[PDB]
Amino acid sequence: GLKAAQKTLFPLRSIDDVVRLFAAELGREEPDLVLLSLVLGFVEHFLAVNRVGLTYFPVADLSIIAALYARFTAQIRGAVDLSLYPREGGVSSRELVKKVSDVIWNSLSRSYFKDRAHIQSLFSFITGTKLDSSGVAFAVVGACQALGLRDVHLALSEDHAWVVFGPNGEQTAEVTWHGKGNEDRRGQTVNAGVAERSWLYLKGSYMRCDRKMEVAFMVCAINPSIDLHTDSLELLQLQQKLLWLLYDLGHLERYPMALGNLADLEELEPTPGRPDPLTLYHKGIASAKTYYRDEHIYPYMYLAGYHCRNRNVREALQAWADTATVIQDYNYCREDEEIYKEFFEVANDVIPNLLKEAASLLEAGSQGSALQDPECFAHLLRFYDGICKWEEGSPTPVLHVGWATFLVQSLGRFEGQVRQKVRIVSPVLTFQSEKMKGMKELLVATKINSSAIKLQLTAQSQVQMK
Numbered sequence: 001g002l003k004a005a006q007k008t009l010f011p012l013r014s015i016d017d018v019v020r021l022f023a024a025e026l027g028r029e030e031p032d033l034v035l036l037s038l039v040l041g042f043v044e045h046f047l048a049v050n051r052v053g054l055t056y057f058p059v060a061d062l063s064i065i066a067a068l069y070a071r072f073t074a075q076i077r078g079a080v081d082l083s084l085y086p087r088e089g090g091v092s093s094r095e096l097v098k099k100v101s102d103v104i105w106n107s108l109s110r111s112y113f114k115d116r117a118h119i120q121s122l123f124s125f126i127t128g129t130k131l132d133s134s135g136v137a138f139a140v141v142g143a144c145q146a147l148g149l150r151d152v153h154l155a156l157s158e159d160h161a162w163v164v165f166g167p168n169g170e171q172t173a174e175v176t177w178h179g180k181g182n183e184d185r186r187g188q189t190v191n192a193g194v195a196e197r198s199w200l201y202l203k204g205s206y207m208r209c210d211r212k213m214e215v216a217f218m219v220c221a222i223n224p225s226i227d228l229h230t231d232s233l234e235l236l237q238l239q240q241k242l243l244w245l246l247y248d249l250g251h252l253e254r255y256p257m258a259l260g261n262l263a264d265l266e267e268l269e270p271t272p273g274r275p276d277p278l279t280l281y282h283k284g285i286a287s288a289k290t291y292y293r294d295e296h297i298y299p300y301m302y303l304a305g306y307h308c309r310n311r312n313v314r315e316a317l318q319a320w321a322d323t324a325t326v327i328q329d330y331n332y333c334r335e336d337e338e339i340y341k342e343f344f345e346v347a348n349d350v351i352p353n354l355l356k357e358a359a360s361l362l363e364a365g366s367q368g369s370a371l372q373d374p375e376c377f378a379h380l381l382r383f384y385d386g387i388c389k390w391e392e393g394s395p396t397p398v399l400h401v402g403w404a405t406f407l408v409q410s411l412g413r414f415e416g417q418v419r420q421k422v423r424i425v426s427p428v429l430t431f432q433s434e435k436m437k438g439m440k441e442l443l444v445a446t447k448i449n450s451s452a453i454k455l456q457l458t459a460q461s462q463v464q465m466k
């Protein structure tokens with residue numbers, strides 16, 4: 001049931017009309033997640049999924065959008081009988097949250113590619129009966145709001161989504177799947193994951209959204225991809241404009257990833273009179289420091305990626321060292337594979353490529369090169385120190401001999417007279433990991449002893465018998 005006041009801006013004929021609808025909704029006591037997700041999904045469908053007939057912008061008529069809204073509300077209200085789940089204190093019960101989750105779940109097509117683009121919004125849920133993992137969580141939160149359950153909110157880590165609810169918003173419930181081939185814990189709390197200090201649950205320093213942050217989530221969720229080679233400029237512009245709206249209203253304050261996404265967009269196409277990408281990456285880091293105990297990994301990866309693309313080797317290594325300094329106080333657990341993949345790619349592909357080019361440019365006479373800077377060698381060492389410390393105490397190991405080949409190569413990119421300048425104290429650098437402490441003498445030697453490095457990084461007990 002859309003209110004008269006919600007309907008007055010239709011039809012939406014442009015990017016800017018969509019921005020106005022968002023502004024209007026964000027100025028209400030409770031922005032309407034269902035309306036907003038349906039609108040975003042409609043426009044994304046007609047700008048990215050099917051552009052046949054497109055001449056400027058896919059006009060969103062009130063009759064179309066209101067009928068989609070009706071389909072959603074009718075589906076939820078008919079399947080979830082609230083009288084069966086008495087609410088005291090204006091708060092929801094775990095049984096009610098589970099029932100809403102089941103309703104969304106049981107609505108989805110039995111089989112589909114769960115990784116596909118453009119299956120994030122309630123437009124996809126209604127028209128395609130498909131949602132991606134975090135899409136299911138969002139749709140549970142949208143359904144709860146539709147039912148009047150003001151206490152149910154989206155919880156987000158850097159790789160997963162669930163809900164919070166209940167007295168003081170203190171309860172957690174799983175409502176969707178995570179990854180592939182994992183067993184789901186739907187209906188359960190996230191306490192076991194928090195207690196094991198996995199990255200997936202951020203030691204409890206995950207995001208607890210209010211309604212405005214849930215709008216920011218749907219905006220981050222917009223996917224401009226038309227195919228592998230092509231983005232919709234219209235959706236990029238829309239996402240960028242909506243992110244700025246949210247930024248100006250204060251609603252990205254506690255949302256590091258959204259700041260990084262806005263920085264990435266500003267790199268591609270800067271908005272005149274706005275902060276530089278670097279300023280925005282730093283605001284993302286500051287957000288993580290202020291609200292989340294500096295326990296997030298991606299704020300530093302966003303920054304490192306920016307410096308990497310710009311071939312600022314020194315600053316990229318600094319930011320990846322800072323990324324490792326966060327991961328060192330985690331336990332590498334089952335289901336943390338995404339972050340392992342990210343670190344593996346940085347160590348074993350991205351850094352090698354950067355240093356290879358740097359070596360060529362040094363041969364060509366570069367001055368101020370990262371390869372002649374002992375502070376950059378220290379950053380490389382701190383990056384490996386955090387990865388080795390991560391591994392300590394973890395229930396599954398991180399390092400192996402594939403990593404050792406690249407470490408030897410990367411060390412070897414720095415001359416001994418540069419490496420010798422780093423002072424490893426118990427540029428000055430302190431190691432936290434036992435692996436790097438035992439490697440200290442090997443690191444500053446004129447010739448790099450590759451076999452001894454390999455043995456130290458992988459703690460291999462023995463060398464070839466015969």
Ligand SMILES: CCCc1cc2c(N3CCN(C4=NCC(C)(C)S4)CC3)ncnc2s1
Binds near residue numbers: 159161217
């Ligand atoms: C999927 C549920 C967890 C979330 C991921 C995410 C998100 N991402 C945006 C894309 N991401 C990154 N892009 C570049 C990166 C530095 C590798 S991290 C991290 C994940 N953005 C905004 N909100 C959320 S909530």
